Amino acid sequence: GFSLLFYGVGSKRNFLEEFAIDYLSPKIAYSQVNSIPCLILNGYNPSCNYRDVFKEITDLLVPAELTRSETKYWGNHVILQIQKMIDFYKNQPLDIKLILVVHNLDGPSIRKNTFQTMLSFLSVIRQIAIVASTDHIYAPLLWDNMKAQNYNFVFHDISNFEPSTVESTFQDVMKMGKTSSGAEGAKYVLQSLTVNSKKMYKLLIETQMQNMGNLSGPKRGTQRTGVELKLFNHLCAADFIASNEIALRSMLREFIEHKMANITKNNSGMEIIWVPYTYAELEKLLKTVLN
Amino acid sequence: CYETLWNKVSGERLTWAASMESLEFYFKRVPKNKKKTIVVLLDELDAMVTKSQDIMYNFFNWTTYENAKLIVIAVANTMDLPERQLGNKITSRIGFTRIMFTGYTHEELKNIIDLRLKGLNDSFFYVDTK
Amino acid sequence: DPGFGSLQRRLLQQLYGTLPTDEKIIFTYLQDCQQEIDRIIKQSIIQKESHSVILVGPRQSYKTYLLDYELSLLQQSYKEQFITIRLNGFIHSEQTAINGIATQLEQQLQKIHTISSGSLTEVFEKILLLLDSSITKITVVFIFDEIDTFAGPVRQTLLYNLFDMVEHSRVPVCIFGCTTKLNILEYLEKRVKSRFSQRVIYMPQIQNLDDMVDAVRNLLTVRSEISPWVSQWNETLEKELSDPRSNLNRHIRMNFETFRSLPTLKNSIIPLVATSKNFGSLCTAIKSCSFLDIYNKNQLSNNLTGRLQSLSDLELAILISAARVALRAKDGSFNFNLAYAEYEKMIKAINSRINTIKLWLKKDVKNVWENLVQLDFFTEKSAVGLRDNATAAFYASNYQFQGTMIPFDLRSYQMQIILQELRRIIPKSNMYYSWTQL
Amino acid sequence: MNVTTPEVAFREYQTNCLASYISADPDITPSNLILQGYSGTGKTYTLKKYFNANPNLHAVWLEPVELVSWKPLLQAIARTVQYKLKTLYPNIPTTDYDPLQVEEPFLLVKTLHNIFVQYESLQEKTCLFLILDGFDSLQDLDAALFNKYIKLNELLPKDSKINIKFIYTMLETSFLQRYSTHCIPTVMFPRYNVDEVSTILVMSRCGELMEDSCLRKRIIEEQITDCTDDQFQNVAANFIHLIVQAFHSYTGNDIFALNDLIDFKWPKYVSRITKENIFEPLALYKSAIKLFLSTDDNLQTYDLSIISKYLLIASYICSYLEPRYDASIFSNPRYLQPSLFAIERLLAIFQAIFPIQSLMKANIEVFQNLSELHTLKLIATTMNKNIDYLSPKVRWKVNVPWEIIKEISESVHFNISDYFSDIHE
DNA sequence: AGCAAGCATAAAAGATCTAAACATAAAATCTGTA
DNA sequence: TACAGATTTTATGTTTAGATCTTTTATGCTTGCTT
Ligand SMILES: Nc1ncnc2c1ncn2[C@@H]1O[C@H](COP(=O)(O)OP(=O)(O)OP(O)(O)=S)[C@@H](O)[C@H]1O
Ligand SMILES: Nc1ncnc2c1ncn2[C@@H]1O[C@H](COP(=O)(O)OP(=O)(O)OP(O)(O)=S)[C@@H](O)[C@H]1O
Ligand SMILES: [Mg+2]
Ligand SMILES: [Mg+2]
């Protein structure tokens, strides 16, 4: 029942992945046929949200649905459900059902108090093993007595001076960080994509900046400035990018999964595609990779 | 905009999204042998496109379909509203017929007023003094 | 005697204006605009001609009074030839005004002889179908108060539709819109401006003292022989208004200079006639107008001076010390620590110059600080009192202000009464009068 | 007038104005009437006395402080108006309108119209008064709600046999002065004098104090015999007078604070009564001086660790002392808000002031204690909802007064005063 | 070494807003099966 | 085979989490200066 924390200088991503997938999961599976599923959290990604992570956890291990009396008055359906998990797993054999691996737990979006509280409450469960890594030197400042008690860490020092090429992918190195935008990871994805997907993304960006210019620089993209999926289908069909809406949705699944574009339903019932990047970031994407 | 138009062309009362899909099918797919020409006047088009601008695109796009016999007459206060809301590419694709209504001059306005009082100016009346 | 009771009731219902419309009194200074209001309405209910008029005037300028008197006057002789829909911008919303119009149309049409059933789209479509289409047409009269609140900058569809009904409908529609803004025209959008007829009636103002004298004479003269005291009451009122040196004329002149509003004067006078027990007391009260002075003194009994005159020794000392530390500070701000330091310095100096004033501790001065804050002698350094809208108040309630986070001792305050004002108010015989001059 | 004016002790003008405005005739009573005054000014008391003296005036008392927002206020008005109307006229067949259907001011207008149109069977017009005790006391209050409530009476039918007349008892004059152009008739309630407060307190509390159980047991325990009707009343009046003349400066002209003080100090005052001192009030006062010398209105400040205590000490020193540590030390300015600093400076000062073992490094435990200190709000940041402790732009500050940090420093035997005595004592 | 005055400017506090998460509901429409 | 009963579709309402913005005071930098 001890969560493992790995700190040091270098990239511990390879260490954590190899330890969890190649050693931990098969060994737990044999000591308990299928291997224990591993949820690899990429905390260096600035677009890591606890809603999606908890949805993945719920999919991996199915919990009891939160009842009407347990939802409270506008209560957090994630925290209450995790407490329900804790109560359910308190009286049950202490096997291991999930191995969630937290790469770079102090990353730009994974360091926030909400997701840290989520991980703190998940750490109480003894049926999931937690193997986390931290790179920041002030990382222990994140956790008070309650969170450091729920984590129940055993700190291990693994310094290896590794390049950390994957962690540096999501933000520019030449600018020397001059972090949470996530547009650099989007561009890195954009070099390696199908030409049809690149054209569809370029059209979406162009129309979204048209909407933003109609509305008004440093403002992010929301559903207020976004394309309707029917209108986007019409545009793509006019440009031969997508034959039908099914193909367009299939293409958009990759961008939605990578947290690049979001489809959300507004008050009118329309479903709107919007890219959560600012005007300058979209212009840079069009000039650099989408030119 | 849709709930009205479909109700004016089908007699059915549908929701706005169902009406939009019905209009798309009616204009794109129904053969021209089973249709009547439609002349739609979009008075004050400024108010329709203020949040999502999809009314303009939907109503102008339906005039591009070969099967559709729609005729849209759009009225707005700004001469460049489609060029802003739709964009240059979409507006160039649609191919409008653009007309500008300049304000009246003093002579034209005087002629309007005179025609409004053609039979009454310099006329004769019987007035009951009581 | 019942005669004086009848006279007093008649006087009170003359002041309140609830006397029958056959004998309602119209002040001479506003007998002109009424004619205009009398004209337009009589050109819409009798001649069946559409009209769109906006009445601009301050609060209590007799807009609703005249607009209701005219409707009552037209009501008794043309009851079945018009219906009235009343809307108020304060209690009606953009979505809610449609429901209000539909419900009022259905109610008035059943009264003279559904539209209010369905969604907002159906209701609006039905009211457009009914209005914006031997035997004549019923005139629809819109009494539409606070027209400026429905003439916002984001969208004006109700006003647009109403003015389009005025122009392009076969049913005669009269739309009266009351507002206080002098620039109501620039509030409307250009389409609504074009649709509006630019018929703005600016309500008359009291420009003379004789106007208020005549208004008071109209208010307080009983013109119906209902009590034995009516003739003597009229004689007394006329002899108290004829001479310019009388107390009633003096108070009328003071109202003319300061307030210049008949409603304030009648509010002052209503308890004057309701308090009197017999006719002699009423005559003496109208000759001396002592109750007017009492009422005026009471009205000014909770402001800064009245609140300051109701402070204990410790609270007054703390207030003076806070005023001194705010005067010394460049920003006019202070906190509990500085104020208490100045207070204890003052108390030490006073006791040294000497039967000794007690120096209360911090725990015994926190309550005084809270009491002085409650009376709004101090406010937060940068605080918004009350938000204008409900949405702004909701947003403020959601936000957690930094002022409540910091400890009570270090909270930065700022006064409403400066040290010079304290020097002026406080009597020269006070113990702390030497300490109100920094 | 047929309206009887109650004899309120110190509200004669206010009662006269209430009788002048509030009358059973709808023609000669204002649509809106306002009662203004501060806490303890006897406005609800005066209105209750006036309405009790006149059982022929129909009143619907409402308390907006319980109804935090406007929708509960409208729903409660709609419910209570029809409930009261049913109570007065149970023989009128009426249909029930659900108060929860009132969700807009227009919905309230429509519901009130529907309720009033079914009472046309009455012979003469009546008016029921909606008293809103504390319209100023709404928690979710803006400057536009009262504008709605002023003009609410215009849209309701003019010829109805049931007239609604609103009465508001607001608290603050700053709120009332926003609506000064509406010319609403207003009755002001000035705060009481010291003599008025003393008389109110004696006439309101002497009867209860003289019948208290503690006095009942004390008189029989001390074997005393005296005039029960009068001597005990005089004793209670003298106690109230002593309380007032001792704590008037502390409380002010506040009836509630003095009532609380009387409740707190009466048992201790009566526990000091005996045979000799009851007859002479001077001796009884001299035997219980300690009661009237201290207000006593209060009902090792922290159990923090030595690391947490030294972290707080270092944070206070860092925040309230300028970054001139380089010159001499480590080898009032406290009257103002604490300044801001960084984590590294706090850690350096903590290492400097921590007792040697030869120096204390920043373990996991130190950072855990610092994060706990921020959790307990003893140390704050420039946080705005989302907070990231690891951002270089986040700066820290202290949230303890001088007394708390002084107690903490003396707990670990640290002289923070000597450090802070350079600028001022 | 140590510090006052002037300046630009990064920053704190908060107004103003959006929108996702949490929630309710009437009409239409899918779905069983007696 | 029409069905009630379960589900989806459409339409707002309530509340929390997160954003950008203006407005105003703190702040490092520069200039001038003496220990
Ligand atoms: N229907 C009415 N009958 C008699 N007197 C009335 C009537 N309506 C208002 N009054 C009185 O007329 C005086 C002022 O006239 P109002 O019409 O109320 O003011 P106003 O012009 O409506 O100002 P607004 O509407 O608040 S901008 C007050 O003393 C009111 O009590
Ligand atoms: N004139 C008076 N005569 C006798 N007792 C009074 C008098 N005025 C106030 N009191 C008493 O003092 C207290 C005052 O209570 P309230 O009249 O309710 O105060 P208030 O003016 O309503 O202030 P708030 O805003 O309601 S807290 C009650 O216990 C009354 O019994
Ligand atoms: Mg009015
Ligand atoms: Mg009260």
Find the residues whose C-beta lies inside 6 A of ligand 1: C 17, 59-65, 68, 145, 178, 180, 263
Q: What is the torsional sign of CA B107, B109, B115, B117? A: negative
C with A: 3 or more CB pairs under 8 Å? no
Contact, D295 vs D261, CB < 8 A?
Answer: yes
Q: Radius of gyration over alpha carbons of chain D, in Å?
A: 32
Contact, D374 vs D304, CB < 8 A?
Answer: no
Residue D252 zone, left/alpha/beta (φ > 0; ψ -120 to 50; rest): left
How far apart are the C-alpha atoms of A215 and A224, rounded to whole Å?
9
Tokens in use for A93?
Answer: 């054999």
Point out the nucleotide closest to A225 (alpha carbon to C1′).
E18
How far apart are the C-alpha atoms of A202 and A207, rounded to whole Å?
9
Residue D290 zone, left/alpha/beta (φ > 0; ψ -120 to 50; rest): alpha
Which 8-state DSSP code applies to residue D180?
A: G
Contact, C378 vs C413, CB < 8 A?
Answer: yes
| DSSP codes joined into one string, D284-344 | HHHTTHHHHH------------HHHHHHHHHHHHHHHS-S-TTSSS---GGGS----B-HH
Contact, D256 vs D201, CB < 8 A?
Answer: no
Pairing of strands A271-274, A262-265: antiparallel
Q: Radius of gyration over alpha carbons of chain B, in Å?
A: 22
Q: What is the torsional sign of CA C316, C317, C322, C328? A: positive
Distance C178 CA to ligand 3 centre (A): 7
The residues, any chain, with a CB within 8 Å of residue D152's CB and separated by 6 or more, are C91, D105, D108, D109, D164, D166
Which 8-state DSSP code applies to residue B72?
A: E
The residues, any chain, with a CB within 8 Å of residue C101's CB and separated by 6 or more, are C85, C87, C127
Q: What is the torsional sign of CA C403, C406, C408, C414? A: negative
Q: Which of A214, A238, A269 sits opposite B84 (nearest CB)?
A: A214
Residue C199 belongs to what H/E stretch? strand C199-202
Question: For residue C333, what is the nearest residue in chain D, using CA coordinates?
Answer: D336
Cβ contacts of A205-212, under 8 Å, gap ≥ 24:
A205/A275, A205/A282, A205/A285, A205/A286, A205/A290, A206/A286, A207/A232, A207/A235, A207/B87, A208/A274, A208/A275, A208/A282, A209/A279, A209/A282, A209/A283, A210/B87, A211/B53, A212/A279
- Are D335 and C337 within 8 A, CB to CB? yes
Tokens in use for C397?
Answer: 């309630």
Range 388-417 of C in CB contact (< 8 A) with D: 388-390, 392-394, 397, 405-407, 409-410, 412
Which 8-state DSSP code applies to residue D423?
A: T
User: Which amino acid is present at A179?
Assistant: T
Strand partners, C145: C88, C178
Q: Radius of gyration over alpha carbons of chain C, in Å?
A: 30
What Å distances lie between residue C355 and B33, C350, D274, CA to CA? 111, 11, 31
* Cα angle for residues C370, C341, D244 (degrees, 5° grid): 45
Ligand 2 atom nearest D189 alpha carbon: 21
Contact, C164 vs C195, CB < 8 A?
Answer: yes
| DSSP codes joined into one string, C242-290 | HSTTSHHHHHHHHHHHHT--HHHHHHHHHHHHHH--SHHHHHHHHHH-H
The residues, any chain, with a CB within 8 Å of residue D301's CB and separated by 6 or more, are D404, D407, D408
Contact, C302 vs D37, CB < 8 A?
Answer: yes
How far apart are the C-alpha atoms of C152 and C147, rounded to whole Å?
10
The pair phi, psi for residue C144, each rounded to 5°, is -120, 85
**Ligand nearest the Cα atom of residue D45:** 2
Q: What is the torsional sign of CA A205, A211, A215, A216? A: positive
- Are B87 and A207 within 8 A, CB to CB? yes
CB neighbours of residue A243 within 10 Å: 11
How far apart are the C-alpha atoms of D260 and D295, rounded to whole Å?
11
State the residue for tokens 């802003």: B84
Q: Which of D183, D191, D248 sits opposite C263 (nearest CB)?
A: D183
What Å distances lie between residue C141 and C68, C128, D379, CA to CA? 12, 15, 65
User: Which amino acid is present at D322?
Assistant: E
- Are D390 and A111 within 8 A, CB to CB? yes
User: Which amino acid is present at A201?
Assistant: Y
| DSSP codes joined into one string, D43-109 | HHHHHHHHHHH-TTSEEEEE-TTTS-SHHHHHHHHHHHHHHHHHHH-TTS------GGG--SHHHHH
Say what the resolution is, in angstroms.
3.0
Helix (H), strand (E) counts: chain D: 18, 7
Contact, B41 vs B4, CB < 8 A?
Answer: no
Q: Which chains have 3 or more CB–CB distances shorter than 8 Å to chain B? A: A, C
Contact, C56 vs C63, CB < 8 A?
Answer: no
B with C: 3 or more CB pairs under 8 Å? yes
Tokens in use for A195?
Answer: 């030409």
Ligand 1 atom 19: the closest Cα is on which residue? C60
| DSSP codes joined into one string, D239-274 | HHHHHHHHHHHHH-S-HHHHHHHHHHHHHHHHHT--
| DSSP codes joined into one string, C54-118 | EEE--TTSSHHHHHHHHHHHHHTTSGGGEEEEEEETTT--HHHHHHHHHHHHHHHHHHH---S-S
Q: Helices A229-238 and A195-215 meet at what angle, rounded to 10?
A: 120
What are the start-end ranges of the H helices in A131-278?
A: 145-151, 183-191, 195-215, 229-238, 245-257
What Å distances lie between residue C438 and C325, C337, D164, CA to CA? 10, 19, 54
Nearest to C417 by CA among C377, C389, C372, C382: C377
What Å distances lie between residue D180 and A82, C215, D20, CA to CA? 55, 22, 21
Residue D385 zone, left/alpha/beta (φ > 0; ψ -120 to 50; rest): left
Distance D41 CA to ligand 4 centre (A): 9
Q: What is the dihedral of CA A120, A122, A125, A128, to 10 degrees?
A: -120
Q: What is the torsional sign of CA D354, D355, D360, D365? A: negative
How far apart are the C-alpha atoms of B65 and D281, rounded to whole Å?
105
State the residue for tokens 């204890």: C344
| A262-265 sheet: strands from edge to edge | A227-228, A271-274, A262-265
D44 Cβ below 6 A of ligand 2: yes
How far apart are the C-alpha atoms of C334 and C343, rounded to whole Å?
13
Q: Is A42 helix (H, G, I), strand (E, B) or coil?
A: strand
User: Which amino acid is present at C301?
Assistant: S
Residue nearest to nucleotide E20 (CA to C1'): A264
The residues, any chain, with a CB within 8 Å of residue C162's CB and separated by 6 or more, are C52, C142, C144, C173, C175
Q: Is A173 exposed, middle or buried (0-12, 13-18, 19+ CB in 10 A)?
A: exposed
Residue D349 belongs to what H/E stretch? helix D343-353
Q: What residues in C contact D1, CB-CB < 8 Å?
A: 5, 8, 274
Contact, C50 vs C236, CB < 8 A?
Answer: no
How far apart are the C-alpha atoms of C16 and C266, rounded to whole Å?
8
Tokens in use for A25?
Answer: 């999961």
State the residue for tokens 């029989």: D220
Tokens in use for B80?
Answer: 């460049």
Q: Check whether residue D386 has its CB closer than 7 Å to nucleic acid strand F.
A: yes
Ligand 2 atom 18: the closest Cα is on which residue? D44
Q: Helices D213-221 and D255-271 meet at what angle, rounded to 10?
A: 20
Contact, D354 vs D348, CB < 8 A?
Answer: no
Instruction: Provide the b/e sequence for C21-46 (b: ≥16 CB within 10 Å).
Output: eeeeebbebbeebbeebeebbeebbe
How far apart are the C-alpha atoms of A79 and A83, rounded to whole Å?
6
State the number of CA atoms in the 13 A half-sphere of C378 facing the CB. Answer: 28
Which 8-state DSSP code applies to residue C220?
A: H
Residue A262 belongs to what H/E stretch? strand A262-265
The residues, any chain, with a CB within 8 Å of residue D46's CB and separated by 6 or more, are D8, D11, D14, D15, D18, D35, D189
How far apart are the C-alpha atoms of C221 and C232, rounded to whole Å?
11
In chain A, domain spans: 1-176, 177-291
Tokens in use for A199?
Answer: 């054209």
How far apart are the C-alpha atoms of C31 and C200, rounded to whole Å?
17
Point out the nucleotide closest to A113 (alpha carbon to C1′).
F17
| A3-7 sheet: strands from edge to edge | A38-42, A98-103, A128-134, A3-7, A153-157
How far apart are the C-alpha atoms of D216 and D233, rounded to whole Å?
13
How far apart are the C-alpha atoms of A190 and A260, rounded to whole Å?
10
Tokens in use for C359?
Answer: 């120096």
Residue C238 belongs to what H/E stretch? helix C230-242
- Are D106 and C100 within 8 A, CB to CB? yes
Distance measured from the CA of protein residue D9 to the C1' of nucleotide F16, in angstroms: 51
State the number of CA atoms in the 13 A half-sphere of A178 facing the CB. Answer: 3
How far apart are the C-alpha atoms of C211 and C207, rounded to whole Å?
7
How far apart are the C-alpha atoms of A15 and A161, rounded to whole Å?
12
Ligand 2 atom 25: the closest Cα is on which residue? D39
Q: What is the dihedral of CA C296, C297, C303, C306, to 10 degrees?
A: 180
How far apart are the C-alpha atoms of D36 and D46, rounded to whole Å?
12
Residue D187 belongs to what H/E stretch? strand D186-189
Residue B37 belongs to what H/E stretch? none
How far apart are the C-alpha atoms of B83 and B79, rounded to whole Å?
9
Strand partners, A131: A4, A101
How far apart are the C-alpha atoms of D232 and D216, rounded to whole Å?
10
